[PDB]
Ligand binder design. Structure first.
Ligand code: HEM
Ligand code: HEM
Ligand SMILES: Cc1cc(N)nc(CCCCCO[C@H]2CNC[C@H]2Cc2cc(C)cc(N)n2)c1
Ligand SMILES: Cc1cc(N)nc(CCCCCO[C@H]2CNC[C@H]2Cc2cc(C)cc(N)n2)c1
Ligand SMILES: C[C@H](O)[C@H](O)[C@H]1CNc2nc(N)[nH]c(=O)c2N1
Ligand SMILES: C[C@H](O)[C@H](O)[C@H]1CNc2nc(N)[nH]c(=O)c2N1
Ligand SMILES: [Zn+2]
Lengths: 411, 407
């Protein structure tokens, strides 16, 4: 079967056939759409079909489908599964798998880059100290003094679900939040709970507005351990504005390396519960969400104050106006310091070209419109006008519960 | 089966049960979500009639009463005998209101119960339709203090006698493609504009010519009527700071009035049912003015602001976008014509969702349409999970009449 998506700005119509390879559920049914819902120990049983699916895909990608090499590898994995209940990936399969999970990530606007990804194989890691060293090297390599390179570090796979490797941080680099006795928050309100766990675990908190959190690392199902990332490895950018000289005196900065550490990578049925990955920022992630969400740094008021906007009625669009300035500042700052960043116009335009290339070469590109459209200036970006189809392909990146809700403490 | 929606800004969780009364299909499956796709007999009719009358009689605290049963009885026998039936005025009014209440793409539904319903079911000609529409326009406009309204022409019969308003909205600006290759006026309406001329409209060939109405009564060929200019309220667009803004010579109309939809009540189909409220500022300033396939004015405005147009990363589009939108709102407010900003509207809609969950057990909402086309994440609806499903009575999209009509 064929499915058409239309672009309402251009009238370009594309045809999707890739959706036929879809497996996991969407959350939707014929009676309900769950498109805006944020969240809508395997037996040998289910495992071999998932392994076979993956290896069939891998072998097709290299033009070796049905070769003796393909067949030998199927047989090898088959035996390993029946014998050990699991199997190990070859390096080439790990690399391919990790690239494809990014390629398949329907909420990611940055996918034009999916084929350039440095994969760090960390499957020999055994301890939290070992995990710390791997993560430092990833941060240093990815940062590359502001000339950001995409990277993923892959720690050993799940075995019985009692021995998981986890990075407790949601991102490698994030700022502490501290709830004060008066109800106000200092630093990032998104990180208060994780901050509290770190304090509990022995972190000495500086208690400022921009304290880089320590890494909290769990190896082999053991209790996690704290480590401070060497400060010299943490690239940061002071935020200033090209025309407003008072913008610097708001005291804002941000880190250059966006690096998601809480997701689960699934490859051929195997589960990698610690797989920190990083790229570079789109300006709005910082300027819109991190700075201007009410539940975050929430700087809209202060910025509009300093701009002396009319703040008494919302229909002055003072918030919208402050919002643009802040985002100019973010892009300006990163550019001036030579730290890789992309604005939401360039990123979305690039994504539309990627998406069309994908339809032509692959027969589709699953995409989640709710996430792909930037959180400011929605309709003046080309993705707003692009119909998208959302479905799940593996290899994939999945949300998993925060580890403090599940971990069984050893003490 | 009982489903939760979470607001990620406030942590408020609501429980949706109303979806279980959902009837129509979404376009989505467990395998593919189509949330972003714009368009995804006697036996059939009695279930539909019954379902409606059951909820009507429930709404008036008289479910399972004799009057309930007597009407179920009466409509029952009227269908078997006539193959259709007629709504009581009370039912028509209740259904029209609920069609709006159920409109999953409408952010303005806090207003749903204040809707003036004009029963035009006695209409028989295009002139009659014209008369009804002028009255609607004048009533709704109300010298700038806008009032919501719908006018309901006769229901579908054998489908060969449909009433239709060929216009997509009651009031829109013409569009003419040029020898120059470019487009004068609104590019959205080029096609409709040519059909008007081909049907006899003498077009003035300007940038903001109010289109004539093209009305189809009783399946006949449609006819042209100019809305009395004095009834079409327009607003000159100026800026509270930039004096030069007026020199762009931008204007918009005060009355948003969708005229191409199909209203379904209790299985009956009302293919001509123009309805109107009042604008959210972004509809004009973000979409009408700045869409690249619309008036597309960003470049000209940015130039007047002398912004750095060298590079996308200076956010000059974004800068000019805000100003343009300030100008729309400012002008409407100055001239005393009802308008709402996206901040106020979305805040109202969060309050409305609350009410609906509490009093009805849910509220169908399409996030892709509800979140404004500018400044999304600084409005509360961005952070609000919504479930989208189809309830009846409803408004439904219908194919442009010219692709259906035989002359
Ligand atoms: C190269 C630069 C990149 C840019 C500009 C980019 C852009 C984005 C943006 C704007 C989002 C939504 C973020 C949000 O609103 O929180 C996103 C989400 C995502 N991206 Fe990309 N990305 C890039 C690299 C990557 C890489 C290297 C991977 C994995 C290998 C990746 C996988 C994802 C996933 C899994 C999500 C969803 C995260 C979640 O559900 O929490 N991204 N990306
Ligand atoms: C009271 C003032 C009103 C406001 C501020 C309002 C707001 C909106 C907005 C912002 C949209 C999205 C339209 C677009 O972006 O093109 C919308 C769509 C819609 N509204 Fe409301 N609305 C109002 C009154 C009404 C009334 C009176 C009805 C019906 C009686 C209604 C039913 C709908 C329907 C059916 C759609 C979707 C139209 C389509 O799919 O093309 N609206 N409205
Ligand atoms: C690799 C990469 C590149 C780039 N430009 N940006 C990123 C950042 C990814 C997102 C990190 C922040 O996401 C947070 C903030 N809101 C949702 C939360 C992540 C999340 C939460 C939930 C509940 C589900 C889900 N799928 N994802 C990562
Ligand atoms: C009553 C009312 C109040 C208010 N504030 N605004 C409105 C205007 C809403 C609709 C006018 C614009 O809709 C056009 C332009 N883009 C989509 C098209 C309507 C449409 C098109 C298609 C293909 C499907 C669909 N459901 N609706 C109406
Ligand atoms: C409720 C809604 O799904 C939620 O707020 C989403 C909307 N779109 C998003 N888009 C991106 N890129 N990131 C997000 O966190 C969200 N949040
Ligand atoms: C493809 C996508 O569904 C389409 O562009 C939508 C997005 N959201 C919208 N939202 C509103 N309110 N009105 C629209 O016309 C659209 N267009
Ligand atoms: Zn869906």
């Amino acid at each position: 079967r064929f499915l058409k998506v239309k672009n309402w700005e251009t009238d370009v119509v594309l045809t999707d056939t890739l959706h036929l390879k879809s497996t996991l559920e969407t959350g939707c049914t014929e009676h309900i759409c769950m498109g805006s819902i944020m969240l809508p120990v395997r037996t040998k049983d289910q495992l071999f079909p998932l392994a076979k699916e993956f290896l069939d895909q891998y072998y097709s990608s290299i033009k070796r489908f049905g070769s003796k090499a393909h067949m030998d590898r199927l047989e090898e994995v088959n035996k390993e599964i029946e014998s050990t209940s699991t199997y190990q990936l070859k390096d080439t399969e790990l690399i391919y798998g990790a690239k494809h999970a990014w390629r398949n990530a329907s909420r990611c606007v940055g996918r034009i880059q999916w084929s350039k990804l440095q994969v760090f194989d960390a499957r020999d890691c055994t301890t939290a100290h070992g995990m710390f060293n791997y993560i430092c090297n990833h941060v240093k390599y990815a940062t590359n003094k502001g000339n950001l390179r995409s990277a993923i570090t892959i720690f050993p796979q799940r075995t019985d679900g009692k021995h998981d490797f986890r990075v407790w941080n949601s991102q490698l680099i994030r700022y502490a939040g501290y709830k004060q006795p008066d109800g106000s928050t200092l630093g990032d309100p998104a990180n208060v709970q994780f901050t509290e766990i770190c304090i509990q675990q022995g972190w000495k908190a500086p208690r400022g507005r921009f304290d880089v959190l320590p890494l909290l690392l769990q190896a082999n199902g053991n209790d996690p351990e704290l480590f401070q990332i060497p400060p010299e490895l943490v690239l940061e950018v002071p935020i200033r504005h090209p025309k407003f000289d008072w913008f610097k005196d708001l005291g804002l900065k941000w880190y250059g390396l966006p690096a998601v550490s809480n997701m689960l990578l699934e490859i051929g049925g195997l589960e990698f519960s610690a797989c920190p990955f990083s790229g570079w920022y789109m300006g709005t992630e910082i300027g819109v969400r991190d700075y201007c969400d009410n539940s975050r740094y929430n700087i809209l008021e202060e910025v509009a104050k300093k701009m002396d906007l009319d703040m008494r009625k919302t229909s002055s669009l003072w918030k919208d106006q402050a919002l643009v300035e802040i985002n100019i500042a973010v892009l300006y700052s990163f550019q001036s310091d030579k730290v890789t960043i992309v604005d939401h116009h360039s990123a979305t335009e690039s994504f539309i070209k990627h998406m069309e290339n994908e339809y032509r070469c692959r027969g589709g590109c699953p995409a989640d419109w709710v996430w792909i459209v930037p959180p400011m200036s929605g309709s003046i970006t080309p993705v707003f006008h692009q119909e998208m189809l959302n479905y799940r392909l593996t290899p994939s990146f999945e949300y998993q519960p925060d580890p403090w809700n599940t971990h069984v403490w050893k003490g």
